[PDB]
Amino acid sequence: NVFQTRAGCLIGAEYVNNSYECDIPIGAGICASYQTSQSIIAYTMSLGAENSVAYSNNSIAIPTNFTISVTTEILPV
Amino acid sequence: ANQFNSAIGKIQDSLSSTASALGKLQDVVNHNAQALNTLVKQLSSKFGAISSVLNDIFSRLDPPEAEVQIDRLITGRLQSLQTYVTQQLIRAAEIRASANLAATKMSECVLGQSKRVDFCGKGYHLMSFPQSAPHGVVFLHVTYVPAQEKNFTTAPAICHDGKAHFPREGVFVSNGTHWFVTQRNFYEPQIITTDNTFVSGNCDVVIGIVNNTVYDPLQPELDS
Amino acid sequence: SMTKTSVDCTMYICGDSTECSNLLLQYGSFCTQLKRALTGIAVEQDKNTQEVFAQVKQIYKTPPIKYFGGFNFSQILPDPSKPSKRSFIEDLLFNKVTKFKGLTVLPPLLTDEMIAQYTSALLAGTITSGWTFGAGAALQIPFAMQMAYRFNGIGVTQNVLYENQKLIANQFNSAIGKIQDSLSSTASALGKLQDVVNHNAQALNTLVKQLSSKFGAISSVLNDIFSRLDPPEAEVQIDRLITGRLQSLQTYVTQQLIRAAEIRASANLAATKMSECVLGQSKRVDFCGKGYHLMSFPQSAPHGVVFLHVTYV
Numbered sequence: 001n002v003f004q005t006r007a008g009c010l011i012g013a014e015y016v017n018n019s020y021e022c023d024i025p026i027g028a029g030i031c032a033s034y035q036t037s038q039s040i041i042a043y044t045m046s047l048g049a050e051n052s053v054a055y056s057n058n059s060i061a062i063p064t065n066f067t068i069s070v071t072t073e074i075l076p077v
Numbered sequence: 078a079n080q081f082n083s084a085i086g087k088i089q090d091s092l093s094s095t096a097s098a099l100g101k102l103q104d105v106v107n108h109n110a111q112a113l114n115t116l117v118k119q120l121s122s123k124f125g126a127i128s129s130v131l132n133d134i135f136s137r138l139d140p141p142e143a144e145v146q147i148d149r150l151i152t153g154r155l156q157s158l159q160t161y162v163t164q165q166l167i168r169a170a171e172i173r174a175s176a177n178l179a180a181t182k183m184s185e186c187v188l189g190q191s192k193r194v195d196f197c198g199k200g201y202h203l204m205s206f207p208q209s210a211p212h213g214v215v216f217l218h219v220t221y222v223p224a225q226e227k228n229f230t231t232a233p234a235i236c237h238d239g240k241a242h243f244p245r246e247g248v249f250v251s252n253g254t255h256w257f258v259t260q261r262n263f264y265e266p267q268i269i270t271t272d273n274t275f276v277s278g279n280c281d282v283v284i285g286i287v288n289n290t291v292y293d294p295l296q297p298e299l300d301s
Numbered sequence: 302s303m304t305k306t307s308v309d310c311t312m313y314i315c316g317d318s319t320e321c322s323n324l325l326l327q328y329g330s331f332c333t334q335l336k337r338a339l340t341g342i343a344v345e346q347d348k349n350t351q352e353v354f355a356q357v358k359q360i361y362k363t364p365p366i367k368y369f370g371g372f373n374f375s376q377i378l379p380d381p382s383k384p385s386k387r388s389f390i391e392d393l394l395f396n397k398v399t400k401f402k403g404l405t406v407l408p409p410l411l412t413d414e415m416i417a418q419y420t421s422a423l424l425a426g427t428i429t430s431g432w433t434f435g436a437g438a439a440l441q442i443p444f445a446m447q448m449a450y451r452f453n454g455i456g457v458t459q460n461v462l463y464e465n466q467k468l469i470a471n472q473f474n475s476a477i478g479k480i481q482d483s484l485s486s487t488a489s490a491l492g493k494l495q496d497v498v499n500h501n502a503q504a505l506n507t508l509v510k511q512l513s514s515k516f517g518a519i520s521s522v523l524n525d526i527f528s529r530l531d532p533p534e535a536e537v538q539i540d541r542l543i544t545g546r547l548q549s550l551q552t553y554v555t556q557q558l559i560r561a562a563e564i565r566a567s568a569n570l571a572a573t574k575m576s577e578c579v580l581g582q583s584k585r586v587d588f589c590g591k592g593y594h595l596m597s598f599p600q601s602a603p604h605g606v607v608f609l610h611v612t613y614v
Contacts, residue, residue: 195576
């Protein structure tokens, strides 16, 4: 019901060991989210998925396929 | 034509549902909505005077007693304008810094091909489609993204007659039996020819050189 | 990024007396919007760390067997033996950059340990995966085939790389050792980041020294006005002290908005050079460094970023 952060004392949240993309930031690595009998949890932020690529001298990787995607950027004028 | 025509319809289904993608243009309006409601709420503040109404000062008091209290109310309304107009000079400097960023992407990305990474959109740039927006502009970036991956066996050079054969444009790949010449973006296996290879140096000074036979097209054309 | 601050209206303007808190209801919304203007700085300071330091959402790691091109890359790679993950250069970068009156310091969101895991992920994508890590999924390109196609953008063929490859390791490892000796001896190269500490320190030392000044009033103490002077004469002398401290507060919020605009254009220059020089190859002159461009190495820095450019002279 209470947790100590580096920013200060946080009361009313539950510390979990799961790490994923959060919504409401707090600070010093601690971030808050509301998910499901429902409460507000606080945890340490995720950097994305783990990928370790292979390395050797003799192995190259050539892509055989392509996918054309459309992205949208909005700049005010 | 199957991949591109489905990709434009995913933009139309996203903008009809999610309204927060256009919320950068909604922060242009909502900062101006708090700015025009700033000066309305300053008129109800008393500014140290007894009443904020100027008809309740000069007609309720002596003319030596009014001009102290009127000049407090004018100077409090001058400082409310000095917070407003200084805020409008700072927030329009972020608009004109983004207007030079928007005019660069209308010049470089839309009118021609640009080689830049994470400027004209993520991946290899093809073309850009501008669309009009209230108080802004909406860009549609057509990009080239590779998908599937396959691991191949490489080597920097091919030793044949004692001279090292370097690739001109392409890479050297192998399926485990024969050595092929493909490209970095795609897999198109080709026959190794003298026009696709470049001859410089010997085979001793190249680290990782392998032995294969470079096919000469002139050698079947001698007797034919 | 800069130092995120927050100013309390109650403790700074008033001397903890009951007369000063009752007179702020007539003044109203003066310090309400100035706290909202410093809140909108502190949102945009966290957005500068998201655009610059993390270009991609995918984390790449170093393989445990290290032989890369006959080169020593161990100065830019982090140390697994230490509990804090830092490289050999970033140990020198962190150490050269150097009471509560109602002013507090907001802590940053992204910690400096998580900045170095954005640093070691994008250095792993540059060495192992080539230039394709930011433009798509990560391929596997060997390191002898990376620099042959990075010479082809500036007009150099593959004859130079494969014959002279033992002579590149005498040139490249001696040039990166002069960068490590120069940053350890002198702190003046990091002095652009030291001014970001120093301009925020002179702004906080401006605001705390305006309490001792009289601002036209007889006494600067609110308890000395109420316990001595008449209450018709107290409302003149207290309201000169409220108005003069709000003019120092109007000076402090406006100068931080100018420094937020100067740090926005430097971070947009920094997020351009992460997207151009680090994640790709540019043909430009004096953008990715002087001369021809080969590759760029980002490093972690307090309140900023340190670029290591590899140039062809």
